[PDB]
Every structure is written in C-alpha cells, then in structure tokens.
Amino acid sequence: IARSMNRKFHRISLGGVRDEAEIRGHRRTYIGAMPGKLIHAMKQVGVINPVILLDEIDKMSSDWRGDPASAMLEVLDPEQNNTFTDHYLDVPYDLSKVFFITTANTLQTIPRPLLDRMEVIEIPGYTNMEKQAIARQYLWPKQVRE
Amino acid sequence: IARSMNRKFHRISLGGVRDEAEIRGHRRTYIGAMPGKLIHAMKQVGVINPVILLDEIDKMSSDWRGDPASAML
Amino acid sequence: QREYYLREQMKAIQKELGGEDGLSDLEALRKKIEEVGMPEAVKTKALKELDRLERMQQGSPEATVARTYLDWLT
Amino acid sequence: QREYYLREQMKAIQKELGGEDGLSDLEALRKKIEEVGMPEAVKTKALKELDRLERMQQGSPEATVARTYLDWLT
Amino acid sequence: QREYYLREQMKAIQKELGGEDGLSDLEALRKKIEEVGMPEAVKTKALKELDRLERMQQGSPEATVARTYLDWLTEVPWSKADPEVLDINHTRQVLDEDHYGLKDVKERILEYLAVRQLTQGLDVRNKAPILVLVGPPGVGKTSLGRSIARSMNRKFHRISLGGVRDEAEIRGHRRTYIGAMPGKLIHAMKQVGVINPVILLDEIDKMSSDWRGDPASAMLEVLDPEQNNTFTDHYLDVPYDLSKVFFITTANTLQTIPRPLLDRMEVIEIPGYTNMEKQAIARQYLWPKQVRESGMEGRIEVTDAAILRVISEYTREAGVRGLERELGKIARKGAKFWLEGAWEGLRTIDASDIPTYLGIPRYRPDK
Amino acid sequence: QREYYLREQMKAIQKELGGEDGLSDLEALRKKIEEVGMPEAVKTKALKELDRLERMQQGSPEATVARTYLDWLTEVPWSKADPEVLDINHTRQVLDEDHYGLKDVKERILEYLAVRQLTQGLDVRNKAPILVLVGPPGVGKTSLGRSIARSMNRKFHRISLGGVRDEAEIRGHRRTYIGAMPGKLIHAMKQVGVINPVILLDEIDKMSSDWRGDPASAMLEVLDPEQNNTFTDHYLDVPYDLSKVFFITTANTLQTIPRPLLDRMEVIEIPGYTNMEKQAIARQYLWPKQVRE
Numbered sequence A: 001i002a003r004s005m006n007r008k009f010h011r012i013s014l015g016g017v018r019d020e021a022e023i024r025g026h027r028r029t030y031i032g033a034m035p036g037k038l039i040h041a042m043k044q045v046g047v048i049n050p051v052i053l054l055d056e057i058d059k060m061s062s063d064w065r066g067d068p069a070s071a072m073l074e075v076l077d078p079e080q081n082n083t084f085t086d087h088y089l090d091v092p093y094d095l096s097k098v099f100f101i102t103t104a105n106t107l108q109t110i111p112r113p114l115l116d117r118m119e120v121i122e123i124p125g126y127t128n129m130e131k132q133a134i135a136r137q138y139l140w141p142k143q144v145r146e
Numbered sequence B: 001i002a003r004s005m006n007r008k009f010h011r012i013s014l015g016g017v018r019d020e021a022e023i024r025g026h027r028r029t030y031i032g033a034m035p036g037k038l039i040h041a042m043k044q045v046g047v048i049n050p051v052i053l054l055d056e057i058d059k060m061s062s063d064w065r066g067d068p069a070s071a072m073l
Numbered sequence C, D: 001q002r003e004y005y006l007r008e009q010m011k012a013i014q015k016e017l018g019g020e021d022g023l024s025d026l027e028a029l030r031k032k033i034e035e036v037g038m039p040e041a042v043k044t045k046a047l048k049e050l051d052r053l054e055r056m057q058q059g060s061p062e063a064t065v066a067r068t069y070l071d072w073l074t
Numbered sequence E: 001q002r003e004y005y006l007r008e009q010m011k012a013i014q015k016e017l018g019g020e021d022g023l024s025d026l027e028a029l030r031k032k033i034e035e036v037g038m039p040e041a042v043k044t045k046a047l048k049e050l051d052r053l054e055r056m057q058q059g060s061p062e063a064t065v066a067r068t069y070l071d072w073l074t075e076v077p078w079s080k081a082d083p084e085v086l087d088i089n090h091t092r093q094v095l096d097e098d099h100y101g102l103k104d105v106k107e108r109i110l111e112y113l114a115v116r117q118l119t120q121g122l123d124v125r126n127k128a129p130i131l132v133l134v135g136p137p138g139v140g141k142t143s144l145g146r147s148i149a150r151s152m153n154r155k156f157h158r159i160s161l162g163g164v165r166d167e168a169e170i171r172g173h174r175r176t177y178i179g180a181m182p183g184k185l186i187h188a189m190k191q192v193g194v195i196n197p198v199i200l201l202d203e204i205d206k207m208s209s210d211w212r213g214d215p216a217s218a219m220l221e222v223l224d225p226e227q228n229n230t231f232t233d234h235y236l237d238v239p240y241d242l243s244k245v246f247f248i249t250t251a252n253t254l255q256t257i258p259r260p261l262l263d264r265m266e267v268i269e270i271p272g273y274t275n276m277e278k279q280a281i282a283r284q285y286l287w288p289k290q291v292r293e294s295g296m297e298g299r300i301e302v303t304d305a306a307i308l309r310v311i312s313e314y315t316r317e318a319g320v321r322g323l324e325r326e327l328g329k330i331a332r333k334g335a336k337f338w339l340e341g342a343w344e345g346l347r348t349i350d351a352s353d354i355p356t357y358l359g360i361p362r363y364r365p366d367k
Numbered sequence F: 001q002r003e004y005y006l007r008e009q010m011k012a013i014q015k016e017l018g019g020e021d022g023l024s025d026l027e028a029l030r031k032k033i034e035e036v037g038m039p040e041a042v043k044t045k046a047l048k049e050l051d052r053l054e055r056m057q058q059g060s061p062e063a064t065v066a067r068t069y070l071d072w073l074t075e076v077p078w079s080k081a082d083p084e085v086l087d088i089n090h091t092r093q094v095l096d097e098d099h100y101g102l103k104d105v106k107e108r109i110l111e112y113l114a115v116r117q118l119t120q121g122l123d124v125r126n127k128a129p130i131l132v133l134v135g136p137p138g139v140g141k142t143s144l145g146r147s148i149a150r151s152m153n154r155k156f157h158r159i160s161l162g163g164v165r166d167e168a169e170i171r172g173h174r175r176t177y178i179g180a181m182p183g184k185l186i187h188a189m190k191q192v193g194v195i196n197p198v199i200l201l202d203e204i205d206k207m208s209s210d211w212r213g214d215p216a217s218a219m220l221e222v223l224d225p226e227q228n229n230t231f232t233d234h235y236l237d238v239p240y241d242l243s244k245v246f247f248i249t250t251a252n253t254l255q256t257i258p259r260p261l262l263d264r265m266e267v268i269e270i271p272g273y274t275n276m277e278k279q280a281i282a283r284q285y286l287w288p289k290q291v292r293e
C-alpha cells in the first residue's frame, strides 16, 4: 500500500513501552529524555503523509497504572489528533495527512471504545497449493540468493 | 440530551474495570500513579457541568482483586 | 583578569538581550493556579506543594512525583 | 541594527575568548526556523530557547536536556 | 588570598611543567586520536574538545572528566580484527577435543563459517542471527563459549547477568556526572583488542525489573542487527557498531525472556546427555582431571564397568556435575587409603569394589 | 637538581595540601600496591587509577570516591596464604571436642585435608569444597562452622541471608552513586586477612525470587565450581578470585532451593539424633554447661 501510493512505511508497535505516558513523550524535568515513540517514527521520515502500521495491537503494554487506551484514543479518533501534544513535544502537532494501519490477531483484548474506529479485515489462511505457489514464487529465491 | 441542554458530552465505557484503583487513584506512594476514570472524564471535558454516559455499569468485573461497585458509591 | 571580566561581558550582552520577562514554567504554574478556581483548602494545598517546588532545585525523583501531582491538580 | 550590534560584540567575545567559542551559537538555528516549518507556537517556545540559553556557554546539566528537546524540536 | 597567591605560584610551576613534562602525552593522545581507526564524526567530536583551560593540578572537576572521556574514546578498538578462519575442517579439528557429543551446535558453527566464507553478495553478512542456548542445568554451555572462541581463534569475554536490574550497566550514565561509568559493553570491548570478538551473555533468564523499567529495552537495542550499527551510549556520544560481534546467550527456559527479544533469536535445544555420552565424557575428560588435582596419578585406576555403576547408582541428573563429584570422592578416598599404608603398581577398581569407596548405593539399579 | 627543585616545589604543595596528601600517603599507596601481589591487569588498572587520582587534592568529591576505591582495592587480600598445617591426628582430636557424633562431616574434613598433603607442587588446581548441610532446626549446624574453622587453624566469618529480598547485597552498587559500597562478600573478605577463609552462608533456602527483588540468581557468580575465578562485583571493576574459599551453607528443605543452585553445591544430610546420641550429648556437653551457668 505504501509503494502503490508512493508512500513510506514504518513499523513501531505495541510492546515497547511501559505505559501510555511512554506512548507519549516525557517533559524536560527529567534527565533521561524519553521522547514520544510516535514522534520518533516521524523524525526518520521527511514526509508527513505515509502510513504507520500498528503490529500486534492486541499484545498490549498495560500495567496496574495505565492502560493503552487514552494515548491511543487521542491518535485514532479523527477529531483530537489535529492538535496533538506530547510531554516531549508540547506544541500543536497535526495528524490529518497520515493514514494509520492497525494490525491485530484477536479483537477480544481490544477495549470497547477503540472499536469505534476499527474496520475488520480478516485472513482466510493458506492452502498447501497456495503455500506451494508462495514458496516457489516468493520464498525460494530470497532464502537461496541470501 | 447534551444538545438540548447545550452542555458538553462525554462517555465513560465501564464493564472493563476490575479494581477500585481504576475508579479512585492508587496512592502517591506507588511509582507513576494516576487517578481514575471520572477524573479522566473531568480532565477531558472543560466545564464543571458536562453530561457523562456510563455504559455497562452492570458488568463491572468485581473479582478477587477488589470491588469497584463500592468505589462507585 | 580577562576570564572574570569577559564572562561578565557575556552576561552584559544577555541582560540586555533577554531583559525583563520573568518567563519560566514555575510562576506560570502559580499563575495557572491563581486564575481558575479554587476552593480554599485545595488552594492552600496547591500553594504548599508549589513552594515545596519553588525554593529548592530541579531534578530529584520525588519532585517528579510532586510535579505530576500538581499537574493533575491543575 | 541593535540586533546586529549586540551580536557583533557577542561574537567579538567569541573570536575574543576564542576557545573555541560562542558555541559559535544562536546565530545559526535562526535559519532553520522558517526553513523547517514552522507554525508560530514552536517559534514562541524555541525563540525562548535562544538567549536565556545564551546566559552562559558551559556544561551544562541544563544544556544537554534542552539540547535534546530543542534539536528534537528543529 | 594567601592561598590564591600560592596557587598562582603552583600553577606557574605547572605551566613550566606542562612545557617540561606535560608535553608529549596529551600531545601524544592528539597523535593517537588522529591515528588509525577513527571515523570522521569521531574525528569531529575529537576536534570538539581542543580549547583547554590548563589547571590540572589544583583540581579540577572540569579537567579530569574530559581527559577521562578522551581516554575512553581512544581506547575502544576502531577497525581492527584478527583474520578470518580459512579451514573449516580445522574447526572440526579444534571443536572435537573439548566435548564429546553436541552435534547441533558444532553444525551451526560450521554452517555460519561456510556462509560467511561463500557469500560474496549481501543480506547475510549483515544479518547473521544470534544463538540462544537452552538446556537443563549441568550440560555444557560456558565451556562451549570457550571452545567456540578458541575454535575460530577469536578473542573472548563473558558478561554475566542476573544480578543486574539497573539499566545503566548495559547503557551507562551521562558523562556530566561525578563517576564516569560506561556500561558493561564498553568494558567488554576494551578488554579484547579486536573489534570482532565473541561475547557470552550469561543468563538472560534472570534480568529482574524495577523502577525506571528493566534493562531489557537496552537488550532490545543491542540484540537487533538493524539499529546497533548506530548504537550510541549515554556515556559515549559517538555511534558505535555492535554488528559483527558474535553473541551467544544461555538460558534454562524461554518464558522469562522478554517477547521483544524473541524476534531476533535462534534457539538451540540441548536435550541432555545419555549413559554412553556420560561414560565417554567421564573417561576422556572427567577422570584425568579428577585424578590430576588429587595427586593419585598412576596409583589408582577405574574400569569401564565401574563408571557405569557410578552413573546408574550414584547420580540422577541431566548433567555431569554429580558424576564429577562422585568421581572426586573416589579420588579422595584413594588418597586417604594411600597414607594408611602404600601398595605397589596401581590398585584397579572394578565395578564391585565401589561401595568401599562410595558407601551405600542410593538409586536402585533397573533390573 | 632541577627535578629536585621541581618536585621539591611539590613537597611544598603537599605541605599546603594537608601537610600530607600530595605525595605522602599517595606514595604509601604506591607501596601497598607494589606490596601483596595482584594480577597484572588489576595492578596496572590500579596504577592508572592512582595516576588519575595523584595530581589532584581536596576536591573534587571524585577524588574522595577514587580514594575509597583505592582503599577498598588495596586492602582486600591478594595472595595472603593461610599455612596448611597438615596433621590429621591433632585435628581429629580437636574436632572430637566440640561435637559428638557427626561422622560424615569429620570424615570429609579428614579426606579434604589428607588430599592437601599430596599436592605435587604445581599441576594441581587446588579447589576448595562447597558444602551444603541439610537438617532439622535443632541439630547443630551453625555451631559446626566455627568448630571446623578452628580445627584447621583458619579464619571464620558469618553471613546471614535470612530474609533478604534485597538484591545488591550480594553484589554492590556501582561506584558512581553517592553512598557506594561493595557487597557483603567482598566486605567479608576484607575483614578477614587471608584468602583461605571459612565463609558460613547461613540461611540460603530462605531468600526471595520475584520480578523485583531476586537475590538468589546473583548467587551464580559466587557458588561457581569453575568460573568463580572471574567474579565481578559492581563496586570493584576487577575480577576477584574466590576459588580457595571453603564455603559452608545451611538449609532446612531441598524443595525451596533454585535448580541452578543445588547442582552448584554438595549435599550432606544430617539425620537428627537418637536416644543414645542425645544421652551422650546430654551427659558430656549439656548438663555441665547448664550446671555452670
């Protein structure tokens, strides 16, 4: 979808933070300046259009303090994201040219309000004929020429 | 109702809560604590008089950890 | 002699350039306290924690907890 | 003109206190303000990261955290 | 005021000294920071520090940490390695005189040497996976670390984890503090002289977490070969490259290893040893060491039925330490019997003369 | 004569430093470094640490931290022998005084001392045992440690690990902190003067294992039958040698000890006592003491 729409592609997904405060940034009051994870993906691109894939959103990063809901609800809703603010950003940031991709395996651990925006794309599996065709076309030249 | 009264609207979706620490806070003596859902809603509304919808207060996961129904009292 | 003099020449430059503002985050927090609200006991609690942040330094890990406490209060 | 002249004598301290100096500084991210972006509010915060930064040119325990935040912001 | 004057006297003497002895060491580091190895950005950060303030006797807190950072930056190895191995049959000549058995690990080493030799394209010299050894306690893991490092004839250093719960032993602290403390990796790289060593990371099962998180995020930052090419520190301010370093990690189970580390892993299950394998290692490695330390060399000898008695009736483990101590007890009992009156030649221990030396057989034999 | 003038000016420097403190006990530190034999990497590391510490005085606090580093490093013993007195009838009669019965452990000490006569100069490894004593609470185990350490004319030290969930008691905090301090074990080696002591780790089956507060996995670098020639604490940045140490640990139940620690240690079980044993223990150990007191 990135190369068809002439866009970039970045991964960065759930499982790398301790709370949604680490989904956001951290203020300069600390010594260890932990940036917002999002902005760090935006730093490595010189384009504010492309997609951002959310691999394994059901594999959360929760704790007894903080569920991964509020920092996700303020970036997935198409309303409050137009003026976005991190603790390591503290300025009006704009999310209207991006088109996010979310990847999951099970909808059951996803909370109820964040299902307001999700659109269900499911996977049928693969036939052994389909896997034989995949392994001829697409896996054998990579793993052999590597 | 929010439009007819001309006030702010907000939605808290309960049913997923499991302890009293997601309705109240925890304590300041635990690293990184925060207050509960009602304080989140008051943070995200702007006035003293919004309306707050409470979806599925009848399905709150009161369990071996605690009972947030008493926290709701 | 030149060291002590010329760094004062540096601060000369700065005291003309910056001037007069009183612009930081601390008295901004105090102003944000004194604008909205407040009930009386809540106000005195916030002023105690504000002074507890004021006369000392910036960097201790309990000051981060008190900072998050005041930021959740405002 | 007053800008030119105050920065004249500031970088006269630079070539004067010439190790190395100045951090040759804050004449220079002045060009990536309008180049990299920017809206007005980022300009309000980061132009209040020029001269009260210029207050000294040593260390710092402040210049590293403000360095990371500002060079993140630019 | 008197102290300020006499400190003037002292530092006057010093600047004649920094003429007299105080040339040709910082000058010699300015040579050696511009000698072979250093990248261009590292040369720029080396040119950053050239404005000195010259008060190195009466203090100074801003004079000694810059010298410390300069020494740490100039002592880590920059672009130097002992050459590649040419014969992979000789790799089998070396790996087989340390361990009986362990086919799979030797095969993976030979495969990695064959792939590194035969590739002249790309996509595998950059991406070579990290071995994760998993096995029950008692099988050989650390001795494999030494045997692999001597097999390829590379240098070696071993980092033990498990007592580490702080992040600043993998990363370090900021260089503006009092104690200049880079992480364990900068120590492990200045120990070896080459830029391509073998590093054994002991016990990634046991990195406990605490406040300010766990150092498992730093482990993600070091055990993924797509960002450690630009691996920077909190102490160092240059991008170092931990790409070619052949990491080997040991473990006892995979659950307590974090899931951000089970993406750039490659598990190898060591199932345990069997009775013939234990008997072969028992002879050819455990017995002459357990007799050479005990001083009873050429005065006592164990048979091969007797090792089978010791294995089947005096140890139940998936490893070889219980067998090691059970042989050591025989060596000590013989060393005690020698002082009560010597014999001639060497007494030989058949499988029936064990319980004189080892008491009651604990585990019944399977009949 | 000009270097005489020059380092004489430095004599005057330390005359104003503390009357001392610039080449007085700094050079006493050079003596005690080139006293008792350190390994050469550790020795040159201590020499460059002394070289970075030498030419400053009285500030900064980094001078104080490095002074305490060279006070720890040059006082923990390096090559401080304990003379193995090799009589096996004297030591048998000394072990027979403090305890009755206990045939297994006394036979073990006689075996592990009869071996140490027949050391054929070099070519041996000289590795000390690592015992674990397992028994019910009343049976004398902690009493036996000082008895064994006195019979062999060695030294003795205790470490109680009774309820520690505190990691970095075993290892230390790294020296960049404020109140930095080594572990329990390097301090236990510091108080003893020799490198052949008898360390009694008291309650090793009562510790903690949790996602925060797991000290039992930090006992891997210590109770190590091969690789404890490379022990790495966090305060000292050098490998310290713990092979010569006659460790004795006690426990109560094997069911609560971690699996990478049972195989590091050598189990010796103590099977309570019987009525004849208790009666003899009573008559010649318990009743005279309770009559005296």
Ligand SMILES: Nc1ncnc2c1ncn2[C@@H]1O[C@H](COP(=O)(O)OP(=O)(O)OP(O)(O)=S)[C@@H](O)[C@H]1O
Binding pocket: E098, E099, E100, E101, E136, E137, E138, E139, E140, E141, E142, E143, E144, E250, E281, E285, E319, E320, E321, F226, F260
């Ligand atoms: N097949 C073998 N050949 C030779 N020596 C062996 C063999 N298997 C084990 N050993 C020896 O047995 C001892 C076990 O070494 P380690 O690998 O440290 O044991 P370990 O199981 O790794 O301990 P942990 O707790 O899992 S780190 C060493 O002395 C090895 O040399």
Ligand SMILES: Nc1ncnc2c1ncn2[C@@H]1O[C@H](COP(=O)(O)OP(=O)(O)OP(O)(O)=S)[C@@H](O)[C@H]1O
Binding pocket: F098, F099, F100, F101, F135, F136, F137, F138, F139, F140, F141, F142, F143, F144, F250, F281, F285
């Ligand atoms: N066989 C014995 N002969 C003489 N005194 C003994 C004997 N067995 C035990 N004692 C004495 O009984 C007491 C037992 O003390 P401890 O050694 O502390 O017992 P302990 O079992 O080590 O305690 P715990 O619960 O195991 S830590 C001491 O006063 C010993 O001297």
